[PDB]
Amino acid sequence: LTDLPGVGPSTAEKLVEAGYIDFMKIATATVGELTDIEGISEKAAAKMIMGARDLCDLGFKSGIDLLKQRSTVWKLSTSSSELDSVLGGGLESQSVTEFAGVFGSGKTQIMHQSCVNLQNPEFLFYDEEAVSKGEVAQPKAVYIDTEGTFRPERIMQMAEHAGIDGQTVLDNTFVARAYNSDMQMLFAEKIEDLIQEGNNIKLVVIDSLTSTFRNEYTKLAERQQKLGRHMATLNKLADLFNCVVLVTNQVSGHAATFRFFVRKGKGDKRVAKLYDSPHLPDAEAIFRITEKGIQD
Ligand SMILES: Nc1ncnc2c1ncn2[C@@H]1O[C@H](COP(=O)(O)OP(=O)(O)O)[C@@H](O)[C@H]1O
Ligand SMILES: [Mg+2]
Ligand SMILES: [Mg+2]
Ligand code: NA
Ligand SMILES: [W+6]
Ligand SMILES: [W+6]
Ligand SMILES: [W+6]
Ligand SMILES: [W+6]
Ligand SMILES: [W+6]
Ligand SMILES: [W+6]
Ligand SMILES: [W+6]
Ligand SMILES: [W+6]
Ligand SMILES: [W+6]
Ligand SMILES: [W+6]
Ligand SMILES: [W+6]
Ligand SMILES: [W+6]
Ligand SMILES: [W+6]
Numbered sequence: 625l626t627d628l629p630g631v632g633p634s635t636a637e638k639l640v641e642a643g644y645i646d647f648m649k650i651a652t653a654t655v656g657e658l659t660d661i662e663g664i665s666e667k668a669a670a671k672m673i674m675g676a677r678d679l680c681d682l683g684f685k686s687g688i689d690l691l692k693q694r695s696t697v698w699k700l701s702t703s704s705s706e707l708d709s710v711l712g713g714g715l716e717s718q719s720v721t722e723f724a725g726v727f728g729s730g731k732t733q734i735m736h737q738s739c740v741n742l743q744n745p746e747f748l749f750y751d752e753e754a755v756s757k758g759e760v761a762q763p764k765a766v767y768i769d770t771e772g773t774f775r776p777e778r779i780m781q782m783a784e785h786a787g788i789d790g791q792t793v794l795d796n797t798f799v800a801r802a803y804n805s806d807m808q809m810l811f812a813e814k815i816e817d818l819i820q821e822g823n824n825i826k827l828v829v830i831d832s833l834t835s836t837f838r839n840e841y842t843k844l845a846e847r848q849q850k851l852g853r854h855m856a857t858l859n860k861l862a863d864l865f866n867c868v869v870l871v872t873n874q875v876s877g878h879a880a881t882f883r884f885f886v887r888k889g890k891g892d893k894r895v896a897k898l899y900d901s902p903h904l905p906d907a908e909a910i911f912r913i914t915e916k917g918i919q920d
Pocket of ligand 13: 876
């Protein structure tokens with residue numbers, strides 16, 4: 625931190641005690657959030673922010689640099705060929721992907737399958753010139769469980785059928801049981817704390833995203849508010865930590881970059897329809913849910 629303009633030893637200590645330890649977080653901060661640190665003037669805040677942006681080279685980009693930026697996005701396989709294709713390769717890092725659907729359509733299964741897949745190195749697709757092997761090494765997942773449906777047994781079974789070690793998935797997946805929207809939001813805000821403690825968080829799951837909010841603000845206005853702050857935190861986390869963020873929506877409006885509607889097909893079959901994305905056509909993906917997890 626002292627490399628930053630105006631920042632000396634004591635200011636660097638204050639910054640780290642407020643949780644601002646990397647340049648990117650400072651470069652993307654508002655003067656307000658830094659001045660609210662006290663001991664940190666408004667002029668010093670504007671100076672270190674400008675210095676941070678410069679060290680992170682955050683200005684206008686054009687031509688080939690536009691392609692380079694896009695190449696920093698890596699993708700996580702879903703174990704379904706069809707679903708991966710419709711996704712343009714797999715679940716994207718630096719974006720929030722939402723799976724909505726009726727009860728039993730497979731939302732929680734996909735969340736569990738993703739936690740397992742993260743532990744199979746060959747299921748993370750990336751361009752080696754834009755994403756280094758070290759960036760996706762020892763990846764870990766965070767599962768914020770709002771329903772009480774996380775099942776370690778299911779993790780073990782899906783891992784076994786994929787030929788990877790179940791205990792290893794459990795060891796590298798943090799689960800937070802949230803009973804209301806305050807806990808759900810605080811847990812999401814605390815993921816930055818796990819990352820600074822050395823955990824390479826690369827997958828964040830929120831199952832469910834809207835249940836607590838609907839149960840508490842059954843007030844679309846405020847609800848939408850609190851939910852908007854929650855969504856901004858998820859989108860920022862995805863961008864800044866080059867992380868895949870997945871959320872489920874139990875349906876019977878907000879900022880997701882990819883949105884699916886999953887429905888039941890015959891017995892085993894499920895259909896996932898991508899209905900919103902910034903660059904892909906609407907398309908349907910047929911898959912199945914079996915003891916092996918998600919397949920086809
Ligand atoms: N061990 C398993 N073997 C085969 N199918 C399973 C297994 N566990 C769960 N499923 C399937 O997943 C369905 C439930 O999916 P789930 O993810 O919980 O739905 P949602 O979260 O959308 O309400 C089940 O009813 C069952 O068909
Ligand atoms: Mg993004
Ligand atoms: Mg569920
Ligand atoms: Na300095
Ligand atoms: W609603
Ligand atoms: W409602
Ligand atoms: W209603
Ligand atoms: W209504
Ligand atoms: W409503
Ligand atoms: W309505
Ligand atoms: W509804
Ligand atoms: W309704
Ligand atoms: W409703
Ligand atoms: W309605
Ligand atoms: W509605
Ligand atoms: W609609
Ligand atoms: W609409």
